Amino acid sequence: GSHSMRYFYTAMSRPGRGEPRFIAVGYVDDTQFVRFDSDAASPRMAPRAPWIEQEGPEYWDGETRNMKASAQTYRENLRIALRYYNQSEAGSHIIQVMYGCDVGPDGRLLRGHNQYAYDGKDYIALNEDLSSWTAADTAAQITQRKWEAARVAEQLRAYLEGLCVEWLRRYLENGKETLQRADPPKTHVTHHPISDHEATLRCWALGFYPAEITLTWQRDGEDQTQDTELVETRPAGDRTFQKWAAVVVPSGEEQRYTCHVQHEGLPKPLTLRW
C-alpha cells in the first residue's frame, strides 16, 4: 500500500435531544482534508487541508448535497436497525461506516474497502473481491439479501475502481509537497533511575509522518516484547506524530540494551543506546 483515501461516517441517535447527529471526515493517508457536521450552525462540506481549497463551487456544492442526502439516509438506517435488533425508541445507538481505495506506486487500485459497524461491533463488510459480502449476524444477513437484490456491490465496485482512484491521484498531485513527503523520526534515549537497583530506559521518536512506525528494545540482541511498555502513537498537532518505548533494566546493565527504529522516511533502520 503506497497511498489510500478513506471516508469515515458516524451517525448517533439521542432520543429527547433532537435528530441523530451525522458527522463525516475524509483522509488521504494520515492527512484529514474535509469535514461535515449536521450540528454546525450552517452545515456544508468544509476544507481541512490547503490543497483541497482550490476546488471550485461545483465541487463544494456537489459534496454538500451528498452529505445532506447521507445524513437523512443514515437517520433511516438508525430506525431500521431498531427493528433488526428488537430495540426501543428510548435508547441511544451508533452506526459507523469506513470506505475507500488503496493505490500502489503507479496509481493502480491495490484494494477497495467498505465496512459498517453498529454500537461499535462489526455489522457487514464488502469482501476483497468487491463482489460478495460478510455479514456478522442474522440482522446483517437481511441487509446482505437486500444489497444482493439491488446489485449494490457492483455500484461500489464501479466507484472503488473508478472515481475513488481518479480523485485520489488528483489530490496526490495537488498536495505533492506534503502528501508525497515522508518526515523521518528524530530519536533519542533517556535514562531515569527508579531505585539503587533499577532504571527506566525510554526510546523516543518525534516529528514523523506518516504515523506507521516500529520501536523495539533488545537485551543482548534479543527482542524484549513481553517486557517493553509501548504508548499508542499520538498526534503532535502540526501534522506529525510521537511515540515511545520503555524498558526497566538492572543498574550497571544499560549498555546491554539497544533501541531499533523503522520508518518509511529512513534510508535504513536505526540502532540507538543510552
Partner: peptide
C-alpha cells in the same frame, strides 16, 4: 470525492 449513501 465521496460515494453515495446506502439503505441497510
Amino acid at each position: 470525492k465521496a460515494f453515495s449513501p446506502e439503505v441497510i
